[PDB]
Amino acid sequence: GSGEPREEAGALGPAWDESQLRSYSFPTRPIPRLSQSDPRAEELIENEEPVVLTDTNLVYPALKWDLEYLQENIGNGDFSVYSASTHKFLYYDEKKMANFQNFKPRSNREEMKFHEFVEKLQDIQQRGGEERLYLQQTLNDTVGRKIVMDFLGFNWNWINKQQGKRGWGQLTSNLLLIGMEGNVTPAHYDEQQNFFAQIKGYKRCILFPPDQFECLYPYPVHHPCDRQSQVDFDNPDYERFPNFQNVVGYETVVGPGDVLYIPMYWWHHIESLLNGGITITVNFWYKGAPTPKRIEYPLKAHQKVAIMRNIEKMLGEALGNPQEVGPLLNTMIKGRYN
């Protein structure tokens, strides 16, 4: 999967061991770890394939970040902090909750100050509780001068050259992620290009190419969990999701200084290693390049994914009610295309 664990400099031991990885039913192949100066890494990014770049220095000034330094300097703004009773955080589109009245939400959001999230995490650790927290906040203007200086110290030269070379849209946001050990963001896909810059701790990243759509069974587009896989990776229901027995992933473990390119529409399952301490990540999201004027066949897998999304959307509007999308689609194919 992730290969034999890397050895940290200065003979400080292995960065992790296989007992910090969760157990799943599918095989994986390693994502390549390359230098940013390696043309193989440019070839991968251009072909919209994942790659771990080891030496971008993208967030070099942020490698000194921890909770004390952040609490001291990140400012007095509000931070979105997500809770969870188990290791799996259950995200959902709150705007789409109206369409599914029989939807029980289980990972609630709560805005708080940074110093509150820090002492709330210290609250849990000593009381021995099993509640998990996950801070996920877009970096804004309300951060202190020191964080602004660190932010200005990012390798904007390298990443801006990446944005122009690939024809991507401009940077949409930076997401700061601080998570507890063992936290799991379940498999889902995003519609923007992602540079996943690891800062503190180690995160296991399992990626699935867009052509695995058939094996990962995303929720209906109108469901609050749109773009998330319905499959419970810890207890896969092979009767509902038989092609999950065919899924093959791409796996890597990113540590401080690593930058993982997650191509747009690629599924990713992200977990903070067991017993590995808190994790810190900053993401760089770019809107993908505009679709070519004339079409090249055969279509890319992510184009077919977008086609399916648009059919579901347009059908929900045409029928007036997203709940009728399913029965019409079954009416369309039953005994005609299946």
Ligand X SMILES: O=C(O)Cc1cs/c(=N\C(=O)[C@@H]2CCN(S(=O)(=O)c3ccccc3)C2)n1O
* Residue 38 binds to ligand X (criterion: CB under 6 A): no
Report the C-alpha gap between 176 and 138 in whole angstroms. 6
* Residue 93 binds to Zn ion (criterion: CB under 5 A): no
- Residue 163 labeled ligand binder: no
Part of the chain binding a second copy (CB under 8 A), chosen from 66-74, 88-96, 252-260, 302-310: 302-310
Cross-sheet strand order for the sheet of 28-30: 28-30, 249-254, 203-208, 267-272, 184-189
The one among 198, 285, 315, 322 contacting ligand X by CB under 6 A:
285
- Residue 192 labeled ligand binder: yes
Taking Cα atoms as reference points, which of 176, 181, 248, 178 lies closest to residue 215?
A: 248
Q: Shortest Cβ distance from residue 54 to Zn ion (Å)?
A: 22
* Residue 64 binds to a second copy (criterion: CB under 8 A): no
* Residue 225 binds to a second copy (criterion: CB under 8 A): no
* Residue 226 binds to Zn ion (criterion: CB under 5 A): no
Task: Decide if 71 contacts 122 (C-beta within 8 A).
Answer: no
* Residue 148 binds to ligand X (criterion: CB under 6 A): no
The one among 117, 217, 267, 286 contacting a second copy by CB under 8 A:
217
Q: Shortest Cβ distance from residue 293 to a second copy (Å)?
A: 15
Report the C-alpha gap between 101 and 214 in whole angstroms. 27
* Residue 218 binds to a second copy (criterion: CB under 8 A): yes
Task: Decide if 196 contacts 259 (C-beta within 8 A).
Answer: yes
Task: Decide if 259 contacts 158 (C-beta within 8 A).
Answer: no
Instruction: Provide the CA 176 distance to its chain's centre, in angstroms.
Output: 12
192 binds, options Zn ion, ligand X, a second copy, none, Cβ within 5 to 8 A by partner type: ligand X
* Residue 245 binds to a second copy (criterion: CB under 8 A): no
Which DSSP category does 80 fall into? Answer: E
What stretch of H or E contains 138? strand 132-138
Q: What are phi and psi of 331, to 5 degrees?
A: -55, -35
Taking Cα atoms as reference points, which of 182, 177, 107, 77 lies closest to residue 135?
A: 177
- Residue 111 labeled ligand binder: no
Q: Which residue has the tokens 């940074």?
A: 114
Which DSSP category does 243 fall into? Answer: G
Residues belonging to the binding site are 134, 141, 170-172, 185, 188, 190-192, 194, 203, 227-228, 268, 283, 289, 310
Name the site residues for Zn ion (rule: CB under 5 A): 190
Name the site residues for ligand X (rule: CB under 6 A): 136, 172-173, 175, 177, 185, 190-192, 268, 270, 281, 285
Name the site residues for a second copy (rule: CB under 8 A): 213-214, 217-220, 230, 240-243, 295, 297-299, 304, 307-308, 311-312, 315, 318-320, 325-326, 328-338
